[PDB]
Amino acid sequence: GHMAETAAPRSPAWAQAVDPSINLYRMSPTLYRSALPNAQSVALLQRLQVKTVVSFIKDDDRAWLGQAPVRVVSLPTHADRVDDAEVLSVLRQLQAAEREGPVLMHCKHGNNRTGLFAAMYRIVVQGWDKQAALEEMQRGGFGDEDDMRDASAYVRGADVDGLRLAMANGECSPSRFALCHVREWMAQALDRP
Numbered sequence: 001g002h003m004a005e006t007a008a009p010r011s012p013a014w015a016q017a018v019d020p021s022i023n024l025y026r027m028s029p030t031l032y033r034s035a036l037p038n039a040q041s042v043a044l045l046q047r048l049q050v051k052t053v054v055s056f057i058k059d060d061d062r063a064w065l066g067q068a069p070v071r072v073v074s075l076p077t078h079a080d081r082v083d084d085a086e087v088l089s090v091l092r093q094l095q096a097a098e099r100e101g102p103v104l105m106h107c108k109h110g111n112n113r114t115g116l117f118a119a120m121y122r123i124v125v126q127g128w129d130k131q132a133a134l135e136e137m138q139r140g141g142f143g144d145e146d147d148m149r150d151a152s153a154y155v156r157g158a159d160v161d162g163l164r165l166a167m168a169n170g171e172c173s174p175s176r177f178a179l180c181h182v183r184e185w186m187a188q189a190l191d192r193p
Contacts, residue, residue: 014135017090019044024106027135030098030126031032034106035120039064048069049101049189052094058177059186066191073097079110083166084158092119095125115141120153 001020015033022041024034032048034041039053042065045053051070052079057063061072075093076191077085094117097103107114115136122128133145143149177183 008140009138012135012138015139018048022105025098025139026130026133027118028122029102030122031094031118032102032104033111033114033136034104035108035111035114037106037108042066042070045104045148048104050104051101052097052103054105054107060110060184062184062187062190067189075105077107077113080157082116082154082157084112084163085166085170087098087154088160089115091121091125094121107155111139112141114155115139116150116154123133132135 001021001023003020007099015027018024018026018032022034022036022038022044023042024032024041026153027033032050037053041053045065046068046126047050052074053070054074055061055072056074061070061154069143070154073093076082076089081134093107094103105114105118118132119133119136119142123130123132130145133142135143142151174180
């Protein structure tokens with residue numbers, strides 16, 4: 001895409017732009033990161049075995065995948081929802097999906113907030129090392145491991161009140177689309193002759 005490539009440290013061995021169209025980079029092969037949920041990503045997803053993509057859709061994800069049995073997942077990581085309870089809820093979701101293959105988590109415009117999870121998620125659920133955060137650290141999400149840039153934003157939400165009220169106000173709040181019944185109801189294929 002038209003992104004000024006004259007940024008970042010010297011060429012990361014870790015994150016390289018695999019597809020600069022949707023801004024998907026290669027990150028550690030137990031997780032992926034992108035930005036744009038564009039329908040042209042479908043073919044790429046299949047190659048990378050990415051059968052889990054975090055994107056927002058009213059209808060079934062099949063509407064843009066076509067025939068690709070990729071599962072688009074609805075995460076508690078909203079524009080600003082992520083509490084101390086929501087973060088765990090995110091963590092346990094991707095490590096569950098990892099059983100089927102690599103997972104693509106992203107935000108359309110929220111690269112730092114994606115890095116929030118992508119950095120340390122694998123450390124806490126997989127047992128990776130804190131250094132493994134380096135991937136999104138150098139991406140700008142964390143920026144620095146100690147003097148973390150965006151990480152603290154989530155932490156301001158993860159407060160004593162943030163945690164207790166997440167629980168206290170987290171009762172009777174289901175999803176109708178992805179939880180009630182209409183999930184994967186639309187079609188199995190909306191593409192291919």
